[PDB]
Amino acid sequence: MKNIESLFDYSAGQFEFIDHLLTMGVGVHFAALIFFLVVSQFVAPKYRIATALSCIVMVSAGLILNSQAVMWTDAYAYVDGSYQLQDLTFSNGYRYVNWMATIPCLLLQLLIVLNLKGKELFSTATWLILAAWGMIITGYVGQLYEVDDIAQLMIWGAVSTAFFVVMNWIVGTKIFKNRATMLGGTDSTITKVFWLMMFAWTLYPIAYLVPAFMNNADGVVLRQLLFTIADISSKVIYGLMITYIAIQQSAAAGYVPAQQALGRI
Numbered sequence: 379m380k381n382i383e384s385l386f387d388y389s390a391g392q393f394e395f396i397d398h399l400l401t402m403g404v405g406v407h408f409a410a411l412i413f414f415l416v417v418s419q420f421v422a423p424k425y426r427i428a429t430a431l432s433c434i435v436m437v438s439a440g441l442i443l444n445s446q447a448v449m450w451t452d453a454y455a456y457v458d459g460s461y462q463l464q465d466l467t468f469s470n471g472y473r474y475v476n477w478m479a480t481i482p483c484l485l486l487q488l489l490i491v492l493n494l495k496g497k498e499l500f501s502t503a504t505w506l507i508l509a510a511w512g513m514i515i516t517g518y519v520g521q522l523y524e525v526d527d528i529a530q531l532m533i534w535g536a537v538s539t540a541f542f543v544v545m546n547w548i549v550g551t552k553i554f555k556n557r558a559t560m561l562g563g564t565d566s567t568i569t570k571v572f573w574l575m576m577f578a579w580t581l582y583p584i585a586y587l588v589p590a591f592m593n594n595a596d597g598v599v600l601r602q603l604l605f606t607i608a609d610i611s612s613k614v615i616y617g618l619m620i621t622y623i624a625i626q627q628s629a630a631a632g633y634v635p636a637q638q639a640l641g642r643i
């Protein structure tokens with residue numbers, strides 16, 4: 379049960395573009411990691427964990443993007459005018475394993491800026507993480523068959539989509555029922571984060587389906603391109619909005635370092 383990446387030889391332009399996409403993603407996440415670390419001091423204690431979760435996400439994704447980059451250059455060699463598969467192996471499956479950690483972190487930092495606490499926070503986080511883990515795990519099993527069994531990729535993806543929809547319903551319901559509690563005008567900002575999340579996370583099932591409608595070397599490139607757009611949107615851009623909401627609410631709650639931080643800009 380191979381992946382479609384192992385099926386093709388690659389032109390130098392295709393190979394280097396994919397490598398440059400992954401290495402670019404590493405640099406963006408580690409550059410954002412520094413930003414999230416420095417602005418941590420400008421967030422009130424109640425919200426500071428949300429910015430720390432951005433730091434964990436940046437290193438988690440950055441390590442897996444660097445991992446994918448070197449595996450790409452390990453597994454292929456330029457022979458007779460094209461990059462051909464060598465002794466080693468490349469696989470998008472390590473992305474799925476990493477999602478088991480990064481997705482709960484992304485969801486947790488949203489619940490924190492929604493001002494959920496105590497029993498409701500733990501309760502809502504447990505249902506969301508369980509739904510997300512069911513989405514990822516059924517998706518992982520599905521892509522094992524992206525070459526061998528296209529019908530199984532479809533059926534496991536339908537199961538995965540059911541968890542995805544239920545997960546989004548919980549997220550959206552909590553957002554619209556707790557919007558009134560949010561400070562500094564961030565009741566307007568949080569609805570924008572929900573829509574950004576809808577857009578960015580939907581890119582992943584689209585990349586999952588690439589083997590069904592573009593099973594060639596250019597579809598390998600398009601999938602990595604979609605992953606890159608989705609990774610930056612769902613982690614970096616999303617994290618900046620979460621951090622903005624965290625600081626804005628900190629300032630409205632009387633945190634002086636937050637108020638000063640916004641004043642200078």
Ligand SMILES: *C/C=C(C)/C=C/C=C(C)/C=C/C1=C(C)CCCC1(C)C
Pocket residue numbers: 477480481484513514516517518535538539542579580582583586608609612613
């Ligand atoms: C930073 C990485 C993120 C936010 C990854 C998100 C992943 C998903 C939303 C996964 C979606 C899937 C389905 C809805 C159906 C097909 C299989 C998956 C696992 C790709």
Ligand SMILES: CCCCCCCCCC
Pocket residue numbers: 401404405408409412
């Ligand atoms: C600003 C510190 C970010 C530097 C990123 C390092 C890129 C490593 C590419 C292998």
Ligand SMILES: CCCCCCCCCC
Pocket residue numbers: 498501502505548
């Ligand atoms: C207030 C407790 C949060 C529960 C929201 C809905 C959970 C989904 C059960 C599937």
Ligand SMILES: CCCCCCCCCC
Pocket residue numbers: 543546547550551554
């Ligand atoms: C289709 C997944 C979208 C779920 C959003 C529902 C939010 C409305 C709650 C009032």
Ligand SMILES: CCCCCC
Pocket residue numbers: 469471472475
């Ligand atoms: C060996 C492929 C990577 C999957 C990790 C469980």
Ligand SMILES: CCCCCC
Pocket residue numbers: 536539540543
């Ligand atoms: C997998 C089909 C679910 C769609 C529900 C809106």
Ligand SMILES: CCCCCC
Pocket residue numbers: 615
């Ligand atoms: C035009 C690109 C918008 C980026 C905002 C973060």
Ligand SMILES: CCCCCC
Pocket residue numbers: 417618619621622625639
């Ligand atoms: C310096 C706080 C602003 C964060 C959002 C870009």
Ligand SMILES: [Br-]
Pocket residue numbers: 422423424425
């Ligand atoms: Br506080």
Ligand SMILES: [Br-]
Pocket residue numbers: 438439442476477480
């Ligand atoms: Br990730």
Ligand SMILES: [Br-]
Pocket residue numbers: 554555
């Ligand atoms: Br409602």
